[PDB]
Amino acid sequence: DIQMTQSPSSLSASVGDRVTITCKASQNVDTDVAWFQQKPGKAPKGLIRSASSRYSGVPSRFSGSGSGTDFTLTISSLQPEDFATYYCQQYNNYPLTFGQGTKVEIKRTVAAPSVFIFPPSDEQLKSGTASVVCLLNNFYPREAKVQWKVDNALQSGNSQESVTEQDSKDSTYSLSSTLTLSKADYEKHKVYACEVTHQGLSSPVTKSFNRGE
């Protein structure tokens, strides 16, 4: 098996920037390298084959270079519809292998998240489950850290988060971390809080509620 090590994992740039994506093969693959573009929820689309040959309809700003082990996808002038995920593929040797991918995001001014917190509704509490939601609305960059604190006790392993794709208008993200507990464990405590650490905040911001109000 030939390894295709794609660098970097993610990459932030502005419209009109020249951007470079890299793929390193663990051994010679000649020029049997292809590049693919993929946008969320859609099928991958071919860009380059044979290291450097564009497919029909691929804008000239996409170009491929390399022979042997080191290959480079280049976008000369990044366009709005070019922000997506790109994969390199080796077809020189069985099995065909892909790179882990490269996400190309839009660069933006740093923006702090609007933090909210929601208690579990009474209709949900009629069953045996209770979910506490912590919302981080419209922020940049994506790197964020959310910690739950129940009566000033740090939780772990009982919360999942989900992030939205970059917004088409203001190029911001939104995250929702959900804390799941049984109805018995929920009513054993009173103070629920989520501590949000982000680059755009000078000190961690905490939003909380008391069980009852």
Next chain:
Amino acid sequence: EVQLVQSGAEVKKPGASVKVSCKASGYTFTSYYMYWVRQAPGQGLEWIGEINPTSGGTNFNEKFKSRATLTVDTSTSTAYLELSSLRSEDTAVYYCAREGGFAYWGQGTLVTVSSASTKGPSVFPLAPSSGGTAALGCLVKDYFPEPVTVSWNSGALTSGVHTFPAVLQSSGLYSLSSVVTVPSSSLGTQTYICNVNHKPSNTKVDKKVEPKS
């Protein structure tokens, strides 16, 4: 016009087999290999294998050689992938692609492998806390399988809405949150109702989101 259309989504039990089709049109089917790619949710691409449509010969990734079968019906220009001994790690989108020439790809086929059965969602309100801008939403919890569509006020309220991707809970059921930001002054004046729809269970729920008293 050339296109590769694939069969619809499939849901299977951790032991059954699945057979996905890929009908080609617009080119001589027997002149090109057909290879199959798999992509786990939020993950990279993976090469399964390829088939020579004239001879039926195949080349497989060793990971799938024991439990995968590629066939072809040259009379209908259709390629089939059968995956048996299914496990939850096989939950992914399956693509067919043409080897050589313009890089045509199918639209994809979603195959879900879980122990759960087709369940309906539970819609719970996320009530606003209550200054200037506040947030509210709906918690769509415990359903199977995907997808779940959410709109607000039959689609009249669109701006400020952030419907999050679903997450796979430990129970094998999907949970999703959908939030929206509105002025604090419109609380009590405006009605906010989220329209959850789960076609697999033929469920349509309209939940009214108010501040609690």
Next chain:
Amino acid sequence: ILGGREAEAHARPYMASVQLNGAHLCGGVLVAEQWVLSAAHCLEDAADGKVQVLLGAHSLSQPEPSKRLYDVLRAVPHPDSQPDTIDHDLLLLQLSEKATLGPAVRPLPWQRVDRDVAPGTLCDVAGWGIVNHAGRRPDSLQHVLLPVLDRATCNRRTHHDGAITERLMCAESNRRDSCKGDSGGPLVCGGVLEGVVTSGSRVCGNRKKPGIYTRVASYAAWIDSVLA
């Protein structure tokens, strides 16, 4: 002809040498008393060069009783051939007079039935083209046996990347291949002309890039129309 050896003199009496200004340029096969079939791309760069066909030859230079050099009265490239592609790479040359048939000069019947040759089939190809990686040319006719490679394999992105249509066919190129100067020559399967060597813009002997051959059966109506 890479990986082969010198043929028996005049054992392939259909073999022709298309000449440009008195030098070997391409292979060719006599398909009628007055017509030789070759590759259209041989004459793209020929300009006003004198086109001649050498029949009944084994050595291009040594004297042989059956050798006769014919002037070309009429050159008919396939009307849909162009320098940019390998499609329709066929050429029909009309000789100044009917060739003097004999034990060393005899037309080869060409395949009129449009079936693909089964893969792996060994076929015979001959020419005066390159015989070693150094790019040098032989004086006497060379030949080699090549196994046919199926079209789908040949169309993989590593090989010819979908360039092989239904009117083309491939043969393996590992140490045995047809090279520059073998173009227009015959690819004989089952004692019948199956393909015409194209090549031209391809380096030979690399298993990664198989040899390409124009299937004569796919152009039967045109050949008949010109020879009629």
